[PDB]
mmCIF file of C-alpha atoms in Angstrom:
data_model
loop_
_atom_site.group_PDB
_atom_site.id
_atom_site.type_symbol
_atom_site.label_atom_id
_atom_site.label_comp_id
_atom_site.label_asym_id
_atom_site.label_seq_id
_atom_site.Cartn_x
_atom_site.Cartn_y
_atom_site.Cartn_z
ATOM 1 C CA UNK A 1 160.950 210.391 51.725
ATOM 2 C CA UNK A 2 158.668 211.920 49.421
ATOM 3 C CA UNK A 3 160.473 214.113 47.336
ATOM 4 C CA UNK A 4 164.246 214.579 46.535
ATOM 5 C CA UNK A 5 164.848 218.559 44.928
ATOM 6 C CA UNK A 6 168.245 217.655 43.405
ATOM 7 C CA UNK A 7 169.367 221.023 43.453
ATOM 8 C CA UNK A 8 168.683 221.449 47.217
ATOM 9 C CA UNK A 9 170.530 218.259 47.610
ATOM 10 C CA UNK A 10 173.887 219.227 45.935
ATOM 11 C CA UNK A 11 173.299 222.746 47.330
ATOM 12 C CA UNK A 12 173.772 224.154 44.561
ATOM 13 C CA UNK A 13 172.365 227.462 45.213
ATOM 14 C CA UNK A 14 175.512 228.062 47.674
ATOM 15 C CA UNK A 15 177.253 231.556 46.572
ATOM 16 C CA UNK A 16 179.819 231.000 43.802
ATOM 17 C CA UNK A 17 179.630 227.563 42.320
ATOM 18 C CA UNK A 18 178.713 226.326 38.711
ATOM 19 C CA UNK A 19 175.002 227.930 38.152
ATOM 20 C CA UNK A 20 174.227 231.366 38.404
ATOM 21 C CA UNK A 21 170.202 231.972 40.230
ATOM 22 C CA UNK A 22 167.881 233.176 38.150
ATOM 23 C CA UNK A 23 163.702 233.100 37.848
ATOM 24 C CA UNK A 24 161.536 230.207 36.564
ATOM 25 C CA UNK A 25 158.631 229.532 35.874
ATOM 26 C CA UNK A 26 157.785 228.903 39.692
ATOM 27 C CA UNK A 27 157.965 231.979 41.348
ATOM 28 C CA UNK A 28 158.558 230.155 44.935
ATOM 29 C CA UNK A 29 161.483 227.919 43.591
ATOM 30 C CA UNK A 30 164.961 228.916 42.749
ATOM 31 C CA UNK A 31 166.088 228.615 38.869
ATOM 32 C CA UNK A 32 169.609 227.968 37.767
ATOM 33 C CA UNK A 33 171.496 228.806 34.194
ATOM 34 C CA UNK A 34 174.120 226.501 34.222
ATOM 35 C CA UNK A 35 177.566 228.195 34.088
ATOM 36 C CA UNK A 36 180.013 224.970 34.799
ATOM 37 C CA UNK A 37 177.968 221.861 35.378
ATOM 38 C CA UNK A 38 181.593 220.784 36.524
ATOM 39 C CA UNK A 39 181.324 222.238 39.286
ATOM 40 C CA UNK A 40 178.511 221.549 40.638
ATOM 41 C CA UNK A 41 178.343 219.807 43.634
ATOM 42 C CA UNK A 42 177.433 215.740 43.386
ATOM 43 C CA UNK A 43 174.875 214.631 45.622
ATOM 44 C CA UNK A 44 176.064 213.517 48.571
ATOM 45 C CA UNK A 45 176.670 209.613 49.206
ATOM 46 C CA UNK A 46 174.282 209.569 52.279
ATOM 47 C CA UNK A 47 171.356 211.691 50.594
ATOM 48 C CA UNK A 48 171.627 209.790 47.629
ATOM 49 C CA UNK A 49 171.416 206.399 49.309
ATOM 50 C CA UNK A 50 167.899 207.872 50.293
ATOM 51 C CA UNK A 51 166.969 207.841 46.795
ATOM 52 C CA UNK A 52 168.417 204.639 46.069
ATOM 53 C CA UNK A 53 166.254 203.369 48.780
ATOM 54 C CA UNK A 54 163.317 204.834 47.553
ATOM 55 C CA UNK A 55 164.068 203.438 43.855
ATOM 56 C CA UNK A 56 164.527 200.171 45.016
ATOM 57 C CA UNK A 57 161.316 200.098 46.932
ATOM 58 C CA UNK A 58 159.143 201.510 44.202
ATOM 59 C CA UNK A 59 160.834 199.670 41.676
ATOM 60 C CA UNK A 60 160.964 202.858 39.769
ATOM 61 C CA UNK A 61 160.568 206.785 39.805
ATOM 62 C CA UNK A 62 158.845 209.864 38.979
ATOM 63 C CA UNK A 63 161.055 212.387 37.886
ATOM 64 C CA UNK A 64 159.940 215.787 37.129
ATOM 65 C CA UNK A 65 161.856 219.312 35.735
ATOM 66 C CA UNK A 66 161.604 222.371 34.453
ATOM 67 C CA UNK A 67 163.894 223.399 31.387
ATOM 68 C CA UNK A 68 164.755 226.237 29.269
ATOM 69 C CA UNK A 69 167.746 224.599 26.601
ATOM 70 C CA UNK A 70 169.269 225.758 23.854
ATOM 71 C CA UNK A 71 167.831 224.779 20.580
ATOM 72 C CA UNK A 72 169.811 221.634 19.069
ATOM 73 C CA UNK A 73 172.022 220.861 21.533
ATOM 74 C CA UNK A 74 171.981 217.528 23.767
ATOM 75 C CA UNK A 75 171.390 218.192 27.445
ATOM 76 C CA UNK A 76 172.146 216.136 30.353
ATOM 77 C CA UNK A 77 169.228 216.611 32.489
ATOM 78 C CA UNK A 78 171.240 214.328 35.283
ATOM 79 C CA UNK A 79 173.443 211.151 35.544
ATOM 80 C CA UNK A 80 174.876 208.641 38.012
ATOM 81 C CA UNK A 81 178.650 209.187 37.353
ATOM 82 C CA UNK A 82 180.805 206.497 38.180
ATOM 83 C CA UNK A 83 182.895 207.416 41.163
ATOM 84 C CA UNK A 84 186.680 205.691 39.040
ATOM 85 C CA UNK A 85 185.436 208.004 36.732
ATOM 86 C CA UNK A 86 185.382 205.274 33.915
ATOM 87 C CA UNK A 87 181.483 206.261 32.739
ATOM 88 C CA UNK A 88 177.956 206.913 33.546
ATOM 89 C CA UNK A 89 175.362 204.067 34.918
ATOM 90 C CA UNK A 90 172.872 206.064 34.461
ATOM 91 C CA UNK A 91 171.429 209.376 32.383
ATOM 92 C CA UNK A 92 168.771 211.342 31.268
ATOM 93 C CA UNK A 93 169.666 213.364 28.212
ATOM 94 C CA UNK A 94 167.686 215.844 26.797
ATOM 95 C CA UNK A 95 168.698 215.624 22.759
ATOM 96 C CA UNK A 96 167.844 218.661 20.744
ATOM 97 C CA UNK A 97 169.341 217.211 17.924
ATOM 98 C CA UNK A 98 167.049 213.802 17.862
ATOM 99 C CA UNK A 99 164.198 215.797 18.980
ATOM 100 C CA UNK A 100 164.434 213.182 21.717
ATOM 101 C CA UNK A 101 164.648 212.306 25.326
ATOM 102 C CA UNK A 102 167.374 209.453 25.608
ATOM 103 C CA UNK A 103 167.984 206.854 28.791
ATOM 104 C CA UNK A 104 170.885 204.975 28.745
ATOM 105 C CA UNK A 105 171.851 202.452 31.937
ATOM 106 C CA UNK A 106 174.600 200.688 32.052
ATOM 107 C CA UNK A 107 174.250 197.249 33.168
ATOM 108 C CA UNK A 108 177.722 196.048 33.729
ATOM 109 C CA UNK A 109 180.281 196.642 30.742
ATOM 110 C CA UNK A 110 176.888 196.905 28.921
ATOM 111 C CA UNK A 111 175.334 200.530 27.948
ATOM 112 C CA UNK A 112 171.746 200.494 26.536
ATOM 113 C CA UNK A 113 170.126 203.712 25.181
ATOM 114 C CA UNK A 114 166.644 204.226 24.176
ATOM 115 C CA UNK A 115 164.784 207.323 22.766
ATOM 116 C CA UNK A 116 161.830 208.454 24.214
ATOM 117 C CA UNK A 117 160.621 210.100 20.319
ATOM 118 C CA UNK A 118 158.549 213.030 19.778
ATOM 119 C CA UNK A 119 159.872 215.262 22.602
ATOM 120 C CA UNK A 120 161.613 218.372 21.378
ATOM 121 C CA UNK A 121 162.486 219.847 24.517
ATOM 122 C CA UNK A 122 165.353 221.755 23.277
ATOM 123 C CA UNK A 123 163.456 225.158 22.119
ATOM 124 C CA UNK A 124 164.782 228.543 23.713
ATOM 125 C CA UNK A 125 161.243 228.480 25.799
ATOM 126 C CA UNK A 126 160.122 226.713 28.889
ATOM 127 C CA UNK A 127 159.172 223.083 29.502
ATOM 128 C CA UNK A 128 158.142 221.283 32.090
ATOM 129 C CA UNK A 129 158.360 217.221 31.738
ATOM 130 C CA UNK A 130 157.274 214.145 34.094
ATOM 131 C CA UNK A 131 159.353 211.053 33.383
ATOM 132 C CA UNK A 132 157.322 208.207 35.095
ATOM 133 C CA UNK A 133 159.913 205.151 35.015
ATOM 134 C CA UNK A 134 158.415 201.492 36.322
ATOM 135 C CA UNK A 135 160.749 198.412 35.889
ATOM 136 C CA UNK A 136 161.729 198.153 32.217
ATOM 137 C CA UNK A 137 158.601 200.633 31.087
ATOM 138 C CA UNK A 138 159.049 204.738 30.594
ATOM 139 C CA UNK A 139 156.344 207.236 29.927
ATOM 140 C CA UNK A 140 156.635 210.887 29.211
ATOM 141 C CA UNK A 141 154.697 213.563 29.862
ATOM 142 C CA UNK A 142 155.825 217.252 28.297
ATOM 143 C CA UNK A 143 153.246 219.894 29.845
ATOM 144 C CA UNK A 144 149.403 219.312 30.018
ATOM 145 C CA UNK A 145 149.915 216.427 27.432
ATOM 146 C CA UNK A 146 151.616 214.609 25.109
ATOM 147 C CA UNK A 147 152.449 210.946 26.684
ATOM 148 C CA UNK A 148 155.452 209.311 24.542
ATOM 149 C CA UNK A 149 156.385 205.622 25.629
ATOM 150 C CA UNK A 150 159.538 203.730 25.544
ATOM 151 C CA UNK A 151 160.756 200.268 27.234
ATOM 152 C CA UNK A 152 164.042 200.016 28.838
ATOM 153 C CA UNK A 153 166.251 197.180 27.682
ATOM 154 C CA UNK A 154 166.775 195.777 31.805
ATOM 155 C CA UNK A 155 164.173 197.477 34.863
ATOM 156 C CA UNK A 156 165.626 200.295 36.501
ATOM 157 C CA UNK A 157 166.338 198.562 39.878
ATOM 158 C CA UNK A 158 168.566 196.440 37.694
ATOM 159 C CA UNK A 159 170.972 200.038 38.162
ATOM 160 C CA UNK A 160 169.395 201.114 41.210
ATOM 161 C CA UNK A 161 171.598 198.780 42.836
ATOM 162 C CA UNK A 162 171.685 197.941 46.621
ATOM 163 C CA UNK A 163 175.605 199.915 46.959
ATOM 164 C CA UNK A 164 175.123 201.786 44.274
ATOM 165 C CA UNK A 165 175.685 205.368 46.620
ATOM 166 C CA UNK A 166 179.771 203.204 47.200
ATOM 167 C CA UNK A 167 180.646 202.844 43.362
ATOM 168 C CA UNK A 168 178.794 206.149 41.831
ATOM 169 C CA UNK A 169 177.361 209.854 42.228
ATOM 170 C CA UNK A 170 174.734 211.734 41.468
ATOM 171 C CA UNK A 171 175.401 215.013 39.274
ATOM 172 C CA UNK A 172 172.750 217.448 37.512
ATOM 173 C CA UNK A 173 173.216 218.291 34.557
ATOM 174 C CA UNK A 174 176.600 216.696 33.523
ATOM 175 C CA UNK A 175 177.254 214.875 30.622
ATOM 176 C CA UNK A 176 180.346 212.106 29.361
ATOM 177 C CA UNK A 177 180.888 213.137 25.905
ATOM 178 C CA UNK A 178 180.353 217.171 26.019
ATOM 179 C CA UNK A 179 176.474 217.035 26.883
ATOM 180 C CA UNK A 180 176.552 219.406 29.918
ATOM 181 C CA UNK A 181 173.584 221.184 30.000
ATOM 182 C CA UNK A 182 173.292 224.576 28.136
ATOM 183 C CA UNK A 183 170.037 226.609 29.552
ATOM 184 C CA UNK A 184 168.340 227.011 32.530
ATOM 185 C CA UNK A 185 167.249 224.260 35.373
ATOM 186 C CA UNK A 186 164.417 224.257 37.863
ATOM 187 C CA UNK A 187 162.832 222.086 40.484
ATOM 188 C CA UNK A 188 164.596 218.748 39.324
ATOM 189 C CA UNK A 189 163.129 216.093 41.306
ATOM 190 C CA UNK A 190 162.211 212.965 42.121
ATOM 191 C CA UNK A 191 158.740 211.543 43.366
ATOM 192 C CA UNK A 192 157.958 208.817 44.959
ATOM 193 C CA UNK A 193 154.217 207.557 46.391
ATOM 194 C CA UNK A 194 152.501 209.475 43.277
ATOM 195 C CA UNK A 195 151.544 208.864 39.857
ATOM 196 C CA UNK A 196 151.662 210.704 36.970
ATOM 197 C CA UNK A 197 147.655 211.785 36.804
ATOM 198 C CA UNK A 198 147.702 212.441 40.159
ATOM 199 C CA UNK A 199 150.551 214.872 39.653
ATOM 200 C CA UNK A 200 149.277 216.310 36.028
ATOM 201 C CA UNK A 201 145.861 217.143 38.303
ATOM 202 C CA UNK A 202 147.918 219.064 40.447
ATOM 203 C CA UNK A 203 149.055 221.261 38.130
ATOM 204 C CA UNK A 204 146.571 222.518 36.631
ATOM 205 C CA UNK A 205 146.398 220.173 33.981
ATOM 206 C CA UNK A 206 143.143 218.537 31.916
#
């Protein structure tokens, strides 16, 4: 219940589907260039009721990822798609164009999104971010350093609702508008029981 590869969950490393494998910057993990974020598998409803558990028991989420994106383009890193297929609840967009890293949640006919600001991840070169999300408060961390705040306009659990896994999906890096992501993935996932220092430690970082 610790950690939640999103990837691995999708099974998205099945043969023919999406992503083409590739290396990353971990040697031991799998990489994917994105190909057809379309088709990529969604989470499935019973794996991602795990993380909605998890979520709603934390009140909140560490999410970490690897990326490799195209220089100014906007990048959905992931999203919870509405299953009617009427919009997203939820996303993580990595905006080359803002030099941002926008959230958006949609709160009931309500979408809010804020810019986390100084965090140009979109450059043809590795980066590796932890996205530390507690009720309405967000805090980034792009490699060994730089922390960039933001505050949400309603606290996460406000999405993460109890049925959420009945009324939407999980999908990596798909987009609404045409922000699919362009570039390469790697170990996507979610954290729970940790904290950000504890995790920047185990890195290597200082």
């Amino acid at each position: 219940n610790s950690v939640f590869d999103i990837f691995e969950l999708t099974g998205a490393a099945r043969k023919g589907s999406g992503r083409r494998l590739v290396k990353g910057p971990d040697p031991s993990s799998p990489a994917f260039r994105i190909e057809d974020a379309n088709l990529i598998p969604p989470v499935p409803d019973d794996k991602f009721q795990d993380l909605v558990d998890a979520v709603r028991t934390e009140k909140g989420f560490l999410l970490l990822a690897s990326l490799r994106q195209m220089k100014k383009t906007r990048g959905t890193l992931l999203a919870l798609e509405r299953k009617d297929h009427s919009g997203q609840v939820f996303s993580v967009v990595s905006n080359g164009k803002a030099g941002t890293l926008d959230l958006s949640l949609t709160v009931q006919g309500k979408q809010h999104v804020v810019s986390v600001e100084e965090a140009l991840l979109a450059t043809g070169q590795w980066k590796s971010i932890t996205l530390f999300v507690q009720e309405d408060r967000a805090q980034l961390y792009i490699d060994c350093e730089k922390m960039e705040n933001a505050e949400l306009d309603v606290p996460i659990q406000s999405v993460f609702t109890r049925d959420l896994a009945s009324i939407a999906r999980l999908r990596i890096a798909k987009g609404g508008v045409n922000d699919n992501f362009q570039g390469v993935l790697q170990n996507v996932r979610f954290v729970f029981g940790t904290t950000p220092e504890d995790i920047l430690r185990n890195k290597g970082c200082s």
